[PDB]
Design a protein around this ligand. Sequence first.
Ligand SMILES: Nc1ncnc2c1ncn2[C@@H]1O[C@H](COP(=O)(O)OP(=O)(O)OP(=O)(O)O)[C@@H](O)[C@H]1O
Ligand SMILES: Nc1ncnc2c1ncn2[C@@H]1O[C@H](COP(=O)(O)OP(=O)(O)OP(=O)(O)O)[C@@H](O)[C@H]1O
Ligand SMILES: [Cl-]
Ligand SMILES: [Cl-]
Ligand SMILES: [Cl-]
Ligand SMILES: [Cl-]
Ligand SMILES: [Cl-]
Ligand SMILES: [Cl-]
Lengths: 684, 684
Amino acid sequence: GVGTYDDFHTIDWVREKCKDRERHRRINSKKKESAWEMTKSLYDAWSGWLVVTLTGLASGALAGLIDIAADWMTDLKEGICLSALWYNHEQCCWGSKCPQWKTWAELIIGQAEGPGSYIMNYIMYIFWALSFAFLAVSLVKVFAPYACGSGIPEIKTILSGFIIRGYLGKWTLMIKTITLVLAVASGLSLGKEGPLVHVACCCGNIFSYLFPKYSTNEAKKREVLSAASAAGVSVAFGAPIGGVLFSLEEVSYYFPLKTLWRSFFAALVAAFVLRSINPFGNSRLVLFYVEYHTPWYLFELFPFILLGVFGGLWGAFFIRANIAWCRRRKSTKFGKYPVLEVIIVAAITAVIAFPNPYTRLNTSELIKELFTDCGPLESSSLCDYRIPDRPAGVGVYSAIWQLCLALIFKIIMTVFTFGIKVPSGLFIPSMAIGAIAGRIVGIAVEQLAYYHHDWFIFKEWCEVGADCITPGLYAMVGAAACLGGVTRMTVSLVVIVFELTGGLEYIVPLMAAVMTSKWVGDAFGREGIYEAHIRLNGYPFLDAKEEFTHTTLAADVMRPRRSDPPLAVLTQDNMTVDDIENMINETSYNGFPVIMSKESQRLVGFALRRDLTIAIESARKKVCFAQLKLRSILDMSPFTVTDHTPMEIVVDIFRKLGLRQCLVTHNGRLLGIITKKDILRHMA
Amino acid sequence: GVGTYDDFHTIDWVREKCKDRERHRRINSKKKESAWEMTKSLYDAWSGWLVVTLTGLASGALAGLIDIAADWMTDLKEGICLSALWYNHEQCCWGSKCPQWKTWAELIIGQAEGPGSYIMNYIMYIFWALSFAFLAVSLVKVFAPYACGSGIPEIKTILSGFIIRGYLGKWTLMIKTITLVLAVASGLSLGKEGPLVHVACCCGNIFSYLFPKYSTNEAKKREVLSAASAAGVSVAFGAPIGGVLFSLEEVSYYFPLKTLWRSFFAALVAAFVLRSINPFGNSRLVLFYVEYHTPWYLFELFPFILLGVFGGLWGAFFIRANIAWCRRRKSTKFGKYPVLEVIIVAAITAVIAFPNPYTRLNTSELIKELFTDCGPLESSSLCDYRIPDRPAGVGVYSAIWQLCLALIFKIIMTVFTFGIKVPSGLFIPSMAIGAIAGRIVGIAVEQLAYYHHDWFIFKEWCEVGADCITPGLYAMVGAAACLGGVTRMTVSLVVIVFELTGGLEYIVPLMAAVMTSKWVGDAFGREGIYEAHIRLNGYPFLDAKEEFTHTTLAADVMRPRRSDPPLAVLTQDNMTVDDIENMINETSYNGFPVIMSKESQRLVGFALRRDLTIAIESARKKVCFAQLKLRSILDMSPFTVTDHTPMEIVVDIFRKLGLRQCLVTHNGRLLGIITKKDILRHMA
Ligand SMILES: Nc1ncnc2c1ncn2[C@@H]1O[C@H](COP(=O)(O)OP(=O)(O)OP(=O)(O)O)[C@@H](O)[C@H]1O
Ligand SMILES: Nc1ncnc2c1ncn2[C@@H]1O[C@H](COP(=O)(O)OP(=O)(O)OP(=O)(O)O)[C@@H](O)[C@H]1O
Ligand SMILES: [Cl-]
Ligand SMILES: [Cl-]
Ligand SMILES: [Cl-]
Ligand SMILES: [Cl-]
Ligand SMILES: [Cl-]
Ligand SMILES: [Cl-]
């Protein structure tokens, strides 16, 4: 009861460490009694690894199930396997003019070809997109409203000590899994690689309730959630090291430096399980893994910067636009019709995505297709090729024509499709936009090389009789650049991309593009999409990157100020239960400093509203703060900071010790308070 | 002048960050003036990468020169190349019964063979070992006494805020490089992979003096030294990621999490330069790099854990013996004759090392030879081999006979040879002991398989007609186990070994052996050799691993106590210059809390002894602490901690904020002080 946090309230890390140390000391003291006690001590020491093991296994299994179901449903959106329903397009057209895999054309009209067949299949595609999106949104809105969104901003904030009760519950887990399957299969411009961080964390917290070492403490729960975020990123991208780096850079806030072992173990186990789910012998590390064995020239490092600029522009644009829409979704009647909005967005996406073969094609499959360089047996519109370069024809001319339309559609539709009441991610759509840009640039460069090989730009570098330009590498570079320009990741992202598509040959291009994208995006604000959404949602996230440039001390920020009412303080014996109840029920404060006397104004300690209420209720059912004596709940070591302290030290105290509130005094006299939110309000 | 630290005094991290913020604000304000100011701001922003670049290049070049010179001198200890003096044994016997490479035998006696030849070559080997060791020790003792020892404990401590003035100076760098070349070439049981962490750091600090951003600040110097330690470990083992992990785990103390980029850049550049030094086309990544393409069975994971036990025993034994000797070297007349002690040790090592071919052979070369599994063209005593296994003879029996003697000699002689006045390291000798144990175990297992293949232990796992046991993998496992049992490294060490010897096939055996070694060593004390030597030297190192188990508050530790004289405090106007001078000259304290009046005992601020002295001298050449007015030097935000505070929070303040000293009060009254050393003294 005592020391229980309220909803949407930040965590006093220091008290968590204190009670954890008390538990450790008690366990060690009980250890020496007999063999069972050392056994229990070993069990409690290994609980930190048991939670990570279970979290990794659950994350791997959930990612495998989600991927299988999303593939099957996305393919059900187009046709069905008459021979055996439990197959997708790939399996029903490979495992043997395929007579088994039938689109709705011959099912309904009876003719596989014709304008009527195309119209009816268009209608059926739109209908299935609408049905999937509507079901996902209804299920989220009715069973677990916390399933919406990528949930990386909220997990981030939750690892900064913040609290959101059901956000990582069982029902959020189940509904997020189901609705993520149903949304990635709805044709929306969204992915489930971003959301896989949340659905992974949902596992960890759940498993944290199996062990008293973590259920009864919050800081250790944050350790388990950091490990779970690493496991989630790993199982999403299949990159354990990349996932751990992402956890260090973006998500995790307190890192004792011992959890790196646990984070990497979680990531490794998650990736191992994800690999273990190979029910049909899929050799692809992920649904968008591509390998490269082609060279690049220093000249190509110029366009690889160009994409970096583009990915730096669009990124900023997106963060400049998406929030500008999300605000309008929250500050307008659009926020009262979530289901209608998602149905409208799914209908528009399915209407404008069917005509274009690339937009109609699943975003992760589109990323795979863009990554792979043209093959000899491929005659698709992408590589309709008619000297060191292949000849060109009309087909490659139309390839750019329609790929530009795909790029524009994805850019426009991901702005309106990120924040909506359905599990949506920003990794896959950003990578798709970046990869489309990269493929466009790569085709342009290859065509330039073929038509104008005689120039010294290609005469020396490009070997005669050998194709030198690699469009797939440009697509990968563009994906990395756009992803880093929307999320402002530098090394975590580059390592994620490197593991995502093996090969160290393209570390220089990847670093160049990612760094250029970040340096271009920072010119229009130094906040990534996750930081911008943490800000927009108004979460109490203390960003260490932000600098308290203002030269102001704790004198300015301590509250109450002159205008605000007198500082609320307690006493030792003068007052009674009635007084404390009256001043609690009339005050929204969660904590009261206690002094001896009104005139003395000398600090004694600190007490919390929740602890006071619980203890007072217990006493009433079943006042003397000094030695109704309620000293037990009292805090005799409340952090103080002299008013002359420049606020940088106070912010550093909050960020390092993880306090909720530090008092403020002037030469041994209590004057004000600074909660974890007071500094945030001051920054605004 | 003001705010200058004294010798062997710890660093107030908080003040360093504060003055760094002041400098940042001033530079940013000056930025807007004109183009040159933005140029200067960019220059100061890239200084952090320029220092790391220079440190990495210098570390690579110094490691290359050290390795070349050590090879040449170690080979000069045996013979010379008549055709061209600037060649070692490998080059003078490969680049064409070699007539060029002549040992001293035919040079002096004239006959290459005979008992007299052997005796005189033995005498010359001992003489050259003595000469090299004596020259190294004389040069260290006369030019830079800080060059002695591995210097990893001292660098560690220096990254914890401690200060040692010349320890990373130019002269320590030069003398350490020369004497490390001369000591690794003296036949002593020591290495230069450990010392290269110091030789790298010596570079960084030196380069830190090229830039006001780091010369005038100490915390940023510690960041550069962390990057330099990463670069040093990388250039030593050729493992950038392993070096960065070692810096994170062992050396670095404060990691803002942004220096990881700088640490990895330093490590990468150092390894790149080290590779770039290939004047004779050496394809070996390092002098002891070995590749493996052989399998292992689960059965061998039992002996691979046995070595872990052995490496866990010996490790502890070493940390139970070496310190027990180092104390005796410091608490006895042995400490008054460093040169004589090192000459005696070199003479004994050269006397007992010549007879044994493995002991006579350079420790790094011996590690390389142990790592490589037997080859078809190798007929050495190590693989004197006469069914899935090769037949055996007397030669393999003698191999174990003398390899056990090599193991015993190295174990006994590294205990007496680590701490002595000459640059010595513990990586190579520990790896050599581990690898000798590993080869012993591997040969034993292979012989068991050959003689008793019929047993089901090998009848199933070991394929008929194919050799299954890999002695070289046992050597690697033993090296890793002993290294981790003497240094108590878990993941940094495993990654260092993995990069040092490409191949993920042996990650499971390496983890098993390293973890077993650490868990066995912890049973005999939970401190690595570096921690044990930091303790023995009495450095003020606050080890986060240590737990302040004692349930005592800041009341217990605050000084002065009842017995100690009255707490030293100051006033505002009552006293005069004479009083302050008298109390400074009669007190060894470096800090003085200031209150208003003796009776009020209300805390105002804090003033350091060095600042007081400098300002007082300036005023005398060229008292009113409130608004001789010396408020400017005063600290108006001195950290306080109520006496009821359990010491864990105070230790956490010191470890996170990096304070030197926090005061201690009781209900708004100054009662005591705690320094960074008071908590350490209490722990003892
Ligand atoms: N005892 C007090 N007397 C006066 N002002 C206080 C006292 N305790 C807190 N405050 C101030 O009142 C405001 C509300 O703080 P409060 O304690 O309610 O924060 P919180 O519970 O952490 O936040 P939230 O509003 O999210 O619940 C802040 O300005 C805080 O500084
Ligand atoms: N103003 C003071 N009045 C009384 N005791 C003090 C005062 N300042 C420090 N002390 C105590 O004196 C002892 C040494 O403090 P001091 O300031 O000299 O340490 P230091 O300079 O950091 O250490 P070192 O001895 O390595 O130079 C410690 O017990 C410290 O708590
Ligand atoms: Cl959202
Ligand atoms: Cl997807
Ligand atoms: Cl996301
Ligand atoms: Cl030493
Ligand atoms: Cl060596
Ligand atoms: Cl060492």
